[PDB]
Symmetry: C2
Subunit: 397 residues, 2 copies
């Protein structure tokens, strides 16, 4: 009963704005983030940290703008309000989004914003910069015109803050996930013979927007039939036929925090091969989840999924039929962030880490099945953000 048979206007009747709205991040929590960054800076022997516009700037300062060709950055040192380097003409706009007190250092269009970063270093006798790994390489070129000391990669400091989510972060993420899960549910409901992949993408966007996501669908992949064999798809619109699997991978943000959920379900009657692979995928996902608790190396969670596949005669390693990519990724303010659930990653799981659990099986020439739900690590184990699917024709628990 979850697949097909829902009219567009029936689905529409389940799309009122979401009424269980998590609290934004508070001022105190931004100070705690700065404080934690300072601990990790000192641990690494760094005395200044430069964070570019994008997910990390939003994390530390609230500023949500996307990166551009104009340097917008926070420069954190071991004391005092961090410096916010920003185009002069954007000052009014910056003041309206900041969640953290800052010392603003503004540059007019022809002025060199990298000189301002280094001047603010020199003012506090800081000579050991770490730079945001997400920032454009052009920024290392700019800083090099003025800085002669070693520039360290800030990834350890940034991850060491962001990997473990606070309760407020978890609730924002949960909201986003509950919204997208509903959207997934309605998309499965309106599916019918002949529906276009593009029509389902457009519905999903409309539906996330109606529920009050920040900005509709963050992304959306919809594939039918043989196209499901490509983990990230191929160009081209498809039209649905009985007997095909349907893989829908989509998500939204709520105050920048992501959902990221995949469902793969049959439309019509499945073959034995489809059933067999779908069950195996549910089982691989379930084994990865059972492996999660504090102290467990991230690679062990990936190993747990591959062990199920290999005991069914798939794999080993990335061999196809099997799992050609890692089991999962971290999620937060970015879709993909630390920690990664991947072979070779010894990083121990800690309470509050969030990650995907999406051990997709690909059968070359045929189809793929990806079941994707995220979890967070609790004090004694893990918790699903969204409950896994139940069957090939029952995508929703």
């Amino acid at each position: 009963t979850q697949i097909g048979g829902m009219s567009l206007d029936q689905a529409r009747t389940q799309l009122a704005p979401w009424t269980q709205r998590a609290a934004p991040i508070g001022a105190d929590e931004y100070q705690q983030r700065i404080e934690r960054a300072r601990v990790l800076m000192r641990a690494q022997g760094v005395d200044a940290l430069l964070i570019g516009a994008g997910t990390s700037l939003r994390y530390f300062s609230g500023v949500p703008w996307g990166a551009s060709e104009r340097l917008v950055a926070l420069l954190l040192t071991t004391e005092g309000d961090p410096v916010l380097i920003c185009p002069a003409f954007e000052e009014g706009s910056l003041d309206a989004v900041l969640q953290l007190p800052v010392r603003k250092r503004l540059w007019e269009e022809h002025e060199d914003p990298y000189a301002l970063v280094v001047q603010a270093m020199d003012e506090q006798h800081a000579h050991a910069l770490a730079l945001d790994p997400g920032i454009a390489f052009a920024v290392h070129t700019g800083l090099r015109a003025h800085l002669g000391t070693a520039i360290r990669d800030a990834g350890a400091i940034i991850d060491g803050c962001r990997m473990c989510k606070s309760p407020a972060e978890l609730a924002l993420m949960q909201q986003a996930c509950d919204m997208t899960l509903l959207v997934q549910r309605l998309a499965a409901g309106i599916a019918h013979e002949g529906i276009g992949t593009d029509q389902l993408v457009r519905f999903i966007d409309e539906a996330h927007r109606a529920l009050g996501a920040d900005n509709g669908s963050t992304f959306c992949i919809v594939q039918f039939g043989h196209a499901t064999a490509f983990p990230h798809g191929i160009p081209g619109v498809q039209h649905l036929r009985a007997g095909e699997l349907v893989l829908i991978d989509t998500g939204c943000t709520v105050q920048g925090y992501h959902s990221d959920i995949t469902r793969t379900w049959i439309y019509g009657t499945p073959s034995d091969a489809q059933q067999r692979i779908w069950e195996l995928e549910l089982a691989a996902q379930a084994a990865a989840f059972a492996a999660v608790r504090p102290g467990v190396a991230c690679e062990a969670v990936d190993q747990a999924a591959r062990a199920v596949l290999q005991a069914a005669g798939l794999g080993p390693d990335y061999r196809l039929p099997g799992l050609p990519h890692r089991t999962g990724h971290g999620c937060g303010l970015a879709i993909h962030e630390a920690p990664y659930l991947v072979r070779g990653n010894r990083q121990p799981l800690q309470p509050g880490m969030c990650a995907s659990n999406e051990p997709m099986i690909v059968v070359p020439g045929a189809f793929g099945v990806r079941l994707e739900d995220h979890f967070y690590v609790t004090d004694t184990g893990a918790q699903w953000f969204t409950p896994p699917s139940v069957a090939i024709d029952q995508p929703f628990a």
Copy 2:
């Protein structure tokens, strides 16, 4: 009569799929871009170039994927097919979009892709790498772990290719602009008392899709009244008689961007609105009249500012006036070199494409932004779209 009076029904009658479709970029032109990069690399003493996923990888290879945490890159050396560094699991999906013959070098999830880059360098005896300045700093870290030699910034090489558009690229951008102009005109026509900023966003997207844009609207800003003085925090507004409307939108066609702003009055304008609107047009016109081969980009920005100063606004970036640059290059990116900004000595040359948008802000009152792009010709410039005629005639 450009503004208002049109039904949604009438607008839809002008929304058949675009029939004058510009040719996609062909296999030979990708090879010419690779060749062009190679001479630039030789001119600058560089023997290896790494391009990351994004507009530059698309330019060189046709791969359109946005950058992610996994290295997807093209490594170009002084000879042989370029090397495409890619996750192994994405190989099938990479093959469906590649437009250039490459030597694929695939890595499994636990393997170090930066190692592959350096091994490909070492096989060619390349030791003088330039790195895409748009790529994440993480890639510098990854490469530096394997290299003792300098990692140069590739921006001279990449801009030396991308800034001057081929005829094929100009035609694709022309298509994108012609479609977006129509959308702008329809949006003006359907505007009425009460209409939502959100309803206009939605219609704009629908229209861009109906005409055959790559993916609807690329972006859409719609501002009414006092909000036009705040060019950068969204919020839904409803239209009233006496308000300015500013609509900034664009699409892509084979990834080539349009980016057009129109600002017009709904109802009767005040004398201040009229005077600033006229000034905006004049500033835009003076910038365009400055464009010709060998003019410095900053001379084009100064030409706009001179208009505003002669009329008593400014000076410099002071308001009421022009608080930021006059315009930006445009291509596969909305914003790319060359920038029409004070301090930029870069001389314009034939084929360069940029925006001309010397917005006037009157603080706390309103703003008027007129935005049309141009390309540089052998003797002067050519508008992709013709400028507005009047505060109540947004379309020439």
